[PDB]
Ligand binder design. Structure first.
Ligand SMILES: OC[C@H]1O[C@@H](O)[C@H](O)[C@@H](O)[C@@H]1O
Ligand SMILES: OC[C@H]1O[C@@H](O)[C@H](O)[C@@H](O)[C@@H]1O
Ligand SMILES: OC[C@H]1O[C@@H](O)[C@H](O)[C@@H](O)[C@@H]1O
Ligand SMILES: OC[C@H]1O[C@@H](O)[C@H](O)[C@@H](O)[C@@H]1O
Ligand SMILES: OC[C@H]1O[C@@H](O)[C@H](O)[C@@H](O)[C@@H]1O
Ligand SMILES: OC[C@H]1O[C@@H](O)[C@H](O)[C@@H](O)[C@@H]1O
Ligand SMILES: OC[C@H]1O[C@@H](O)[C@H](O)[C@@H](O)[C@@H]1O
Ligand SMILES: OC[C@H]1O[C@@H](O)[C@H](O)[C@@H](O)[C@@H]1O
Ligand SMILES: [Cl-]
Ligand SMILES: [Cl-]
Ligand SMILES: [Cl-]
Ligand SMILES: [Cl-]
Ligand SMILES: [Cl-]
Ligand SMILES: [Cl-]
Ligand SMILES: [Cl-]
Ligand SMILES: [Cl-]
Ligand SMILES: [Cl-]
Ligand SMILES: [Cl-]
Ligand SMILES: [Cl-]
Ligand SMILES: [Cl-]
Ligand SMILES: [Cl-]
Ligand SMILES: [Cl-]
Ligand code: NA
Ligand code: NA
Ligand code: NA
Ligand code: NA
Ligand code: NA
Ligand code: NA
Ligand code: NA
Ligand code: NA
Lengths: 344, 344
């Protein structure tokens, strides 16, 4: 098992609007979007992109600005749907085949080719890519091996190499990296040790270091980072303390200060942040209240403010954001969302 | 003629450091870089990358994080030098041939291929590109036609199409765009009218609109913008007032508020900014003092603060940056910089 998952995927569109993707009780993908590129914008309300998903749906922006959503189908194949034009209409759901046993994890190579990673029926990591920038056709599936017990997460290093993180059978954090940008040449799997009890989340620091966050065996928030830009060694695991009852979410403030969010034991949203400057000391854990039934999902909007989404007791999606002084009261975006995570 | 030019090219490196490129009295390219990814970092001091340039040297970051500098040679060919590895050492200067009669203008296509634009001996716009992402070999040269009387500037639209801006023989602002990302298919040249007396500068708004700034016939700062994301019509020319004695520079605050900088009649640095939120009303023009002998160069650092560089009366490069309350006193980074602009 893993800590309670994020229930939505969110992106900041090519025109600076937040757009959020979730799953309804009938297993269709629904989306909600800001009308205007500003904190506290009115929302569309939930509309259906249809489909029948058995994973968290994961949105990623092509290098031409077209959103593309990836999800496991009821046949355990990887399916996707894409905007036919930037912030315009959507394709039908189409199958990329395979058999996957995790949520998909997506990143753009330096050459604009999306690459998708997912656990397979053999519990190894598999991958498939666009063959040219933001375009089909897609490559054949292949495996990067390993034995995976969490959803994987991919990021890009500051030198353009993709790097993937996942829990192993020993509950350690393991990773594998491209040896060159845009490559099908990968390293061996290596262990970053620790004991993690959530999916890992990964982000790039202002200074081009990958930093991974995960819940520990003691239900504290732990993190580990590249000690120098796009390079080993890693820092070794450090505790940010707290007692968390969901996966953590991480985002960057517009001054690049990292900020971590998670559900506490009182089922409120809690957060801790780098103080003063990026890579500065972490704050005490503080409450943003609410009563939430999912991990929080954190994103920086077009005004450079963090906005956090979480499911409420009513299964609606609720929203709170940074203000000059503190954070807004929670407001409901309605809907009825389920946790469709392929790994729980 | 055009308003007094920016004398340096600056970028925020893949590891969050400012790195600035200028020209010395013996026509070599020199660079200065922050040691640390923070406002008020110590600087390297100026070191020579050698070469013999007859244009402003223009740095651009490859999609793999490697800096690449472009400049006209004494043979009027396009030359370049690149990092052999991200924030590591440099190649020798190598020729991409051609005959150019402007500073080069560079952008990355959505597919990671750098594309360089420059005026030719026929006064038309010419272009050359990497044939694969962040890699040689380079394409053949070809022309996009037009008749150009300023340095050109290129940007990317929020749908991935490159768009180039330049003054024409009628002193109007003209532009041309790719009809598809990564394409060799371009529009015809179209006039955005006006009368401009500086090089144009172009930036993308938080909400994915191109916005162009230029000095007008009345020596005020004027701007014009796409009315909707990656689309016409344009707004028509609007004055931001002021009386400026250099080209303007533009940068985005970390909340995406646009801020414009230019030399005033008192030879001090002046600025005007969007107030409250991105796309909000523009402020009064305010002084940041100094006595400057170049256009200012503005960049957002890894702490999300604007830093502005300008040549002083001593021909040293000086620097002032945003603080919580206002702006820092000017400090000198030394050196002896010339305006090597291929168009003056
Ligand atoms: O280029 C438009 C779209 O074409 C489809 O064939 C691909 O499967 C998508 O991944 C791509 O975004
Ligand atoms: O070679 C670069 C790679 O080196 C390894 O030692 C690190 O653990 C990776 O995170 C890094 O991407
Ligand atoms: O530079 C080292 C710093 O890196 C940051 O990314 C971490 O969150 C800090 O905890 C750490 O002290
Ligand atoms: O602005 C600095 C920090 O101050 C705290 O009071 C806010 O709640 C954080 O979300 C923010 O990152
Ligand atoms: O790929 C490394 C470098 O190779 C050279 O051949 C190209 O001319 C450069 O533009 C490129 O950055
Ligand atoms: O077709 C898209 C293009 O349309 C033109 O009308 C606009 O002037 C361009 O700025 C835009 O890139
Ligand atoms: O949305 C319209 C606004 O766009 C901004 O990018 C301009 O700088 C403003 O002057 C304009 O009012
Ligand atoms: O922070 C809002 C604005 O306030 C002014 O006082 C600063 O000098 C500007 O540079 C800044 O964009
Ligand atoms: Cl549904
Ligand atoms: Cl379709
Ligand atoms: Cl469909
Ligand atoms: Cl392996
Ligand atoms: Cl728990
Ligand atoms: Cl943004
Ligand atoms: Cl559920
Ligand atoms: Cl020199
Ligand atoms: Cl070389
Ligand atoms: Cl050389
Ligand atoms: Cl034409
Ligand atoms: Cl003047
Ligand atoms: Cl930055
Ligand atoms: Cl000079
Ligand atoms: Na955006
Ligand atoms: Na890559
Ligand atoms: Na990721
Ligand atoms: Na996740
Ligand atoms: Na950077
Ligand atoms: Na392009
Ligand atoms: Na440009
Ligand atoms: Na310029």
């Amino acid at each position: 098992t893993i800590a309670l998952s994020e229930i939505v995927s969110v992106v900041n569109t090519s025109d600076g609007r937040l757009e959020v993707f979730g799953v309804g009780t009938d297993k269709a993908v629904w989306h909600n979007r800001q009308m205007a590129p500003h904190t506290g914008s009115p929302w569309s309300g939930w509309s259906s992109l249809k489909g029948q998903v058995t994973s968290k749906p994961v949105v990623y922006i092509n290098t031409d600005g077209r959103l593309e959503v990836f999800a496991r189908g009821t046949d355990n194949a990887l399916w996707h749907i894409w905007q036919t034009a930037t912030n315009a209409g959507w394709s039908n759901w189409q199958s990329l085949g395979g058999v996957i046993t995790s949520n998909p994890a997506i990143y753009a190579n330096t050459d604009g080719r999306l690459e998708v990673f997912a656990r397979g029926a053999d519990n190894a990591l598999w991958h498939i890519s666009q063959t040219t920038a933001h375009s089909g056709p897609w490559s054949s599936w292949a495996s990067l091996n390993g034995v995976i017990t969490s959803n994987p997460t991919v990021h890009i290093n500051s030198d353009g190499r993709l790097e993937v993180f996942a829990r192993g059978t020993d509950n350690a954090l393991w990773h594998i990296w491209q040896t060159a940008p845009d490559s099908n040449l990968w390293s061996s799997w290596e262990s970053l040790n620790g004991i993690i009890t959530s999916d890992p989340v990964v982000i790039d620091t202002a200074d081009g270091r990958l930093e991974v966050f995960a819940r520990g065996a003691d239900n504290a928030l732990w993190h580990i980072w590249q000690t120098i830009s796009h390079s080993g060694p890693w820092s070794g695991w450090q505790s940010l303390n707290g007692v968390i009852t969901s996966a953590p979410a991480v985002a960057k403030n517009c001054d690049n200060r990292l900020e971590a969010f998670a559900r506490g034991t009182d089922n409120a949203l809690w957060h801790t942040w780098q103080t003063v400057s990026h890579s500065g000391p972490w704050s005490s854990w503080q409450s943003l209240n609410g009563v939430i039934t999912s991990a929080p999902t954190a994103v920086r909007d077009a005004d450079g403010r963090l906005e956090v989404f979480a499911r409420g007791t009513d299964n609606a999606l609720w929203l709170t954001w940074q203000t000059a002084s503190s954070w807004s009261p929670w407001i409901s975006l309605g809907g009825v969302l389920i946790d469709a995570s392929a790994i729980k």
